């Protein structure tokens, strides 16, 4: 007989990244208007500029 | 704030070496700082 | 009479001064080094005589 349903494109709820990501704000449907997170080189095992 | 998670193997069989001694700055500053203050100030103004 | 205008807008990210934050953090490393060095000398060289 004629084929009515033979599957199709399947929508996925989630996109799970497999790579470690740097901290970030919202950039999709929600756009964070605040300043992006500040990166600080805080903990140093050896003195650099002191 | 919370720390970012590591790999799966590092969270099951993971070990780290750490030391908890914070230390103190008292030995360096427990002195007559009258003579050395002028030299320290010059470095201080040069930082910015 | 000849006062110079001082601006630090580029130094501040929002309300955070990165350079001052990292410079102050280096005193923690020095504090750890001072304690470690004093303890090692006391262990290696005991009571001192002249």
Q: Which residue in C33, C34, C30, C12 sits closest to C21, CA to CA? A: C12
Q: Does C21 touch chain A (CB under 8 A)?
A: yes
**Under DSSP, is residue C23 helix (H, G, I), strand (E, B) or coil?**
helix
Q: What is the CA radius of gyration of chain A?
A: 23
Any idea what DSSP says for residue A27?
B
Give the C-alpha separation, A16 to A18, whole Å: 6
Determine contact, residues C33/B27, Cβ cutoff 8 Å.
no
Write the residue in C21, C27, C29 that is nearest to A45 by C-beta. Answer: C29
Q: Which helix (H) or strand (E) holds C17?
A: strand C16-17
Question: Which residues in chain C have Cβ-Cβ distances shorter than 8 Å to A38?
Answer: 13-14, 16, 18
The data reach a resolution, in angstroms, of 2.9
Question: Which residues in chain A have Cβ-Cβ distances shorter than 8 Å to C21?
Answer: 40, 42
Q: How was this structure determined?
A: cryo-EM
């Amino acid at each position: 007989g004629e084929i009515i349903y033979d599957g199709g494109l399947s929508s996925k709820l989630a996109d799970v990244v497999d790579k470690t990501t740097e901290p970030h704000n919202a950039d999709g449907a929600v756009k964070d208007g605040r300043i992006a997170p500040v990166k600080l080189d805080l903990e140093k095992q050896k003195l650099d500029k002191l | 704030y919370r720390p970012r998670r590591f790999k799966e193997i590092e969270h099951t069989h993971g070990y780290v070496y750490r030391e908890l001694n914070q230390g103190s700055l008292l030995p360096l500053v427990d002195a007559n700082l009258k003579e050395s203050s002028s030299y320290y100030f010059k470095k201080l103004m040069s930082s910015i | 009479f000849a006062l110079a205008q001082i601006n630090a807008d580029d130094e501040f990210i929002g309300a955070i001064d990165k350079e001052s934050a990292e410079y102050l953090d280096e005193y923690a490393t020095l504090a750890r080094d001072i304690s470690n060095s004093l303890t090692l000398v006391k262990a290696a060289f005991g009571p001192l005589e002249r």
